[PDB]
């Protein structure tokens, strides 16, 4: 693995950020500084931290299919510098609950 990022646009693709309402995760406001960076790429991404159980509230990662699940947001810090070399750090809720 040499080539930085090859397969598919490099950037542009779909990004989501509503956080449920747990009143605490990981982050809501400094997210949207992380995510200016991919925010900036071509792509969209919405900051934006609510507080309401609608199961409608998730965030979404770039090339990241079916909003049904949802990931961590700190995924940024791993797209933006490992690319897409740890797929495992997902950490996205799973397809049953």
Excluded at 7 to 14: A, D, Y
Excluded at 42 to 55: A, N
């Amino acid at each position: 693995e040499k080539k930085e990022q090859v397969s598919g646009p490099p950037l542009s693709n779909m990004k989501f950020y509503l956080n449920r309402d747990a009143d605490a995760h990981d982050s809501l406001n400094d997210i949207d500084q992380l995510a200016r960076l991919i925010r900036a790429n071509g792509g969209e991404v919405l900051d934006s931290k609510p507080r309401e159980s609608k199961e409608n509230v998730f965030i979404v990662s770039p090339y990241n299919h079916t909003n049904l699940p949802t990931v961590t947001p700190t995924y940024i810090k791993a797209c933006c510098q490992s690319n897409s070399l740890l797929n495992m750090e997902n950490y996205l809720v799973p397809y049953d609950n």
